[PDB]
Structure 1
Amino acid sequence: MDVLYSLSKTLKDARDKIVEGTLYSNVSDLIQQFNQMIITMNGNEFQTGGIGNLPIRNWNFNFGLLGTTLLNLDANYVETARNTIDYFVDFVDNVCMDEMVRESQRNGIAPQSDSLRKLSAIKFKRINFDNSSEYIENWNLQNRRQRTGFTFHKPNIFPYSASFTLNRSQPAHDNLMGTMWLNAGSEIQVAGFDYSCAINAPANIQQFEHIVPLRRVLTTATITLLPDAERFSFPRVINSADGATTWFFNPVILRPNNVEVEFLLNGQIINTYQARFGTIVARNFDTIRLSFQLMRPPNMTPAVAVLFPNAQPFEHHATVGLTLRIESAVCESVLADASETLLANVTSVRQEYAIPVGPVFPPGMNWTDLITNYSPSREDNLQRVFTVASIRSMLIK
């Protein structure tokens, strides 16, 4: 993998630095690395493809070295360099695609493509250059069993889940108490509703709890916490738990009472925020516990009093809410985020070449299913494919 990254990095540096008219002192070391790559690759043959519709291509290498005599690079030098670089970049592209379209249930971190297995040989180790990218750096750290970390903007951690739980219910669904929630990407929206508005609840308070566990531990996360859930604040017709019928939800929003957001790591309270909204920091956690109450307003004006009676015909249903967005985070594992295009690249290559479903990833690289069952084997395969995808995107635009 490091050899593949080195090939990509040296080709990128060659395309950026070997330009007409530049001094040879700007490219002396780069050309030494390039000639080392050419010498190490010459005489070897590779084969990429043969899975799904990905074409089978044979790659041979016989390239003269780049010269070391000009004071300033000229058109001839750049033409030769680019004619070599184009072939090398195509070979890297196809190696990366072949690696991305493959997965393995056992030894998922190891190379899966024939070409990457060949490049894993010691003879190619001389083409190592530097490992400066975040993904390759974490690849090396993971190989060394050292602590890793990827910085994500809006991490796609929570699998899509729009659901509701009812703690009080009747077949008529006319006097309900419960919670509704949407967890998607980096957003949690939870609403606790009570149709009776806690008229008879002890102390005229109804308690609501929402426990969202994560499949991976996040660290140093910035979180925006807002005191309302706009997604559960308008009239709804919702099909019941079993789908046998439908119930009506006509909410009236009150402020959430005694809001407590706890970020727990292995069941230990790492961070706690009481009635604090806005930007907060969770340094280390694997589960989020949102606790909020609906308190019946002790004093009501006539309008609110008419809204909330003491008899069964509850036309308006009291509702409180919380919204929790994860703006940024750090995770020792790989995830999908709103900024990077690695999930997109892997999915796109697989869809384009009609790769059959394998034994590791769910069909079509469905992120919801993957992050719902983020097994260690799936994590190994996902890191491998994402690292090779980043290597590929280093060269392909």
Structure 2
Amino acid sequence: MDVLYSLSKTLKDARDKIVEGTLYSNVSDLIQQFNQMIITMNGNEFQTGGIGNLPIRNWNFDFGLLGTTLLNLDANYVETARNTIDYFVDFVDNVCMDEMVRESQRNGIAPQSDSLRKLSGIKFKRINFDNSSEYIENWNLQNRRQRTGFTFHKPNIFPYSASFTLNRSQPAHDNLMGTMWLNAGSEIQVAGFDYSCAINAPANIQQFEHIVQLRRVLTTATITLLPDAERFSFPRVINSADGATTWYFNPVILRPNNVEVEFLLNGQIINTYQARFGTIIARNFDTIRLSFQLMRPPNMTPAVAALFPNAQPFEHHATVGLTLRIESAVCESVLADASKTMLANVTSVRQEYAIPVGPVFPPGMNWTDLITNYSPSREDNLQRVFTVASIRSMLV
């Protein structure tokens, strides 16, 4: 991985720095690294692609080196380097694609393709140089087993889940009490509804709770908490629990009461925020516990009093809500996120070449299934393919 990353980085630096008119002092070290790469790859035969529709490609390297004494690079030097750069870029792109389309239950972190396995030989270690990207840095630290993490903007940590729970119900679904939530990406919208508006509840307070377990520990996370769940704020017709029938929801939004957000790690309360909205910080957690309450307004204007009678029928259903968006976080494991394109790259490569479904990843690289069952083996293979995808995107 480090050798493949070094190949890609050398080629990117060759494209960027080997330009017409540049001082040779600007590229002396880069030219040395490029010539080392040519020297190491020369005389080696590579084969990439025998899986799905990825065609069998054979790579031979017999390229000449680059000059080292001129003062300023000219068009001749760049023309000489460009053909080698193109061939090497094609080779690296195909190696990255070959590695991205492979998985193993036993050793998912080890190279799977024949080409990357050959590049793990000792003789290719000479190609290795600066490993400065975030993903390669994490790769090396994690190989050494050092505390390292990835920074995500809008981490895709919650598998899709639109569900409801009815604590009070009956076959006619006319006097209900419960919670409905959407868990999607970095967003949690939860809404606790009481059809009776807590007329008969003790102290006229009804308590709703929502517990979300994250499949990986998020650290140094910035969260936006808002007191309304706009997703569950309009009339809906909702399938029953078993799909036997449909029930009617007619929300009237009351502000949530006694809002408490607890960020817990292994059942230990790490962060607690009471009646706090806006930006909050969750330093280290794997579980989110949202506790809110519906309180009857002790004083109601005539229209408000008309909304909530003493007994049934209940035509307007009192709802409180919360919205929790993870703006950014840090996680020791790789995740899909709104900023990076690693998951998109891997999925695109797998789909374009009809890669047969393996024994590790869900078919079609579905992220909801992947994050629902994010096992250590899946984490290993996902880190491998994501690092390869970043390496490839460095050039392609």
TM-score, scaled to structure 2: 1.00
Extract unaligned runs of 5+ from structure 2: none
SS in 1 for 2:271: strand
| Partners of 1:297 and 1:30 in 2: CA distance | 72
Q: CA deviation at 1:76?
A: 1.1
Query: Residue by residue, what CA displacement relative to the aligned partner does 1:170-210 show, whole Å, maximum 9, x if unpaired?
Result: 00000000000000000000000000000001110000000
> Could you say what secondary structure the match of 2:64 adopts?
coil
SS of 2:395's equivalent in the other structure is: coil
CA distance in 2 between partners of 1:268 and 1:93 (Å): 46
Structure-1 separation of matches of 2:302 and 2:221: 44
Kindly provide the CA deviation profile for residues 6-40 of structure 1, in whole angstroms up to 9, marking residues without a partner as x: 00001100110001111111111101111111111
Structure 1 residue 148, shift from structure 2 partner: 1.4
C-alpha distance in 2, partners of 1:223/1:154?
10
Counterpart of 2:100? 100
Deviation at 1:75, TM superposition (A): 1.1
Moved more, 280-289 or 64-73: 64-73
CA distances 1:59-91 after superposition (whole Å, capped 9, x unpaired): 001011111122111111101101100000000
SS where residue 318 of structure 1 aligns? strand
Q: Distance in 2 between matches of 1:324 and 1:188?
A: 5
- Distance in 2, Cα, partners of 1:141 & 1:248: 54
Q: Quick check: 1:283 aligned with 2:283?
A: yes
Are the counterparts in 2 of residues 257 and 293 from structure 1 also a CA contact under 8 Å? Answer: yes
* Counterpart check, 1:207 vs 2:203: no
Percent of aligned positions that are identical? 98
- Secondary structure at 1:350's aligned position in 2? helix
CA distance in 1, matches of 2:34, 2:301: 80
Matched-pair contact (CA < 8 Å) for 1:103–1:359 = yes
Residue 134 of structure 1 pairs with residue 134 of structure 2: yes
**Alpha-carbon distance in 1 for matches of 2:383, 2:118:** 20
2: CA distance, partners of 1:140 / 1:23: 33
1:108 counterpart SS class: coil
Worse-matched range after superposition: 116-125 or 63-72: 63-72
Q: Is the 8 A contact 1:219 1:285 kept in 2?
A: yes
- SS of the aligned residue for 1:182 comes to strand
Once residues 21 and 258 of structure 2 are traced to their aligned partners in structure 1, the CA distance between those partners, rounded to angstroms, is 69
What is the Cα deviation at residue 326 of structure 1?
A: 0.3
Partner SS for 1:321: strand
* Superposition deviation, residue 329 in structure 1: 0.3
The residue aligned with 2:357 is: 357
Q: Give distance in 2, aligned partners of 1:271 and 1:239.
A: 36
Once residues 131 and 101 of structure 1 are traced to their aligned partners in structure 2, the CA distance between those partners, rounded to angstroms, is 23
Per-residue CA shift, 1:196-244, capped at 9, x if unaligned?
0000011100000000010000001110000000000000000100000
Task: Give yes or no for contact 1:15–1:85 (8 Å, CA) kept in 2.
Answer: yes
CA distance in 1, matches of 2:354, 2:31: 39
Match of 2:32 in 1: 32
1:260 aligns with 2:243: no
Q: Identify unmatched segments of 5+ residues in structure 1.
A: none
SS in 2 for 1:180: strand
- 1:235 alignment partner in structure 2: 235
Question: Is the contact made by 1:49 and 1:57 (CA closer than 8 Å) also made in structure 2?
Answer: yes
Contact 1:148 1:333 in 2 (8 A): no
**67-76 or 312-321, which moves further after superposition?**
67-76
Contact 1:351 1:364 survives alignment (8 Å)? yes
Question: Size of the alignment, in residue pairs?
Answer: 396
In structure 1, distance between residues paired with 2:15 and 2:168 = 66
Q: 1 CA distance for matches of 2:163 and 2:129?
A: 51
Contact 1:158 1:183 in 2 (8 A): yes
- Corresponding residue SS for 1:221: strand
Counterpart-to-counterpart distance in 2, 1:34 and 1:355 = 33
The separation in 2 between residues aligned to 1:275 and 1:300, in whole angstroms, is 23
Say which SS state the counterpart of residue 247 (structure 1) adopts: strand
The answer to whether the Cα contact below 8 Å between 1:164 and 1:178 also exists between their aligned partners in 2 is yes
| Aligned-pair CA distance for 1:311 | 1.2
Q: After the TM superposition, which of the residue ranges 67-76 and 359-368 deviates more from structure 2?
A: 67-76
Q: SS of the counterpart of 1:394? A: helix
Q: Is the 8 A contact 1:150 1:330 kept in 2?
A: yes
Mapped partners of 2:311, 2:89: distance in 1: 75
Q: Distance in 1 between matches of 2:8 and 2:277?
A: 46
Note the alpha carbon deviations across 1:317-353, whole angstroms, 9 max, x for none: 0000000000000000000000110000000000000
Deviation by residue 1:85-118 (Cα, 9 ceiling, x = unmatched) = 0000000000000000011111000000000000
Provide, for residues 118-156 of structure 1, a one-character-per-residue CA deviation record: whole Å limited to 9, x for no partner. Answer: 000000001111100000000001100111100000000
CA offsets 1:248-291 (integer angstroms, 9 cap, x no match): 00010001000000000111100000000000000000000000
2:32 and 2:131 map into 1 onto residues whose CA distance is: 17
- Distance across 2 between alignment mates of 1:306 and 1:83: 80
Shift of 1:163: 0.3
Contact 1:166 1:176 (8 Å CA) reproduced: yes
Distance 1:259 1:76 in 2: 69
Aligned mates of 1:70, 1:339 — CA distance in 2: 42
Rounded to whole Å, the distance in 1 between the matches of 2:276 and 2:72 is: 62
Deviation per residue, 1:349-385 (Å, 9 max, x gap): 0000011111000010000000000000000000000
Distance 2:40 2:250 in 1: 71
Name whichever of 248-257 and 68-77 sits farther off: 68-77
- CA RMSD of the aligned region, Å? 0.5
Moved over 4 A (4+): none
Distance 2:151 2:137 in 1: 13
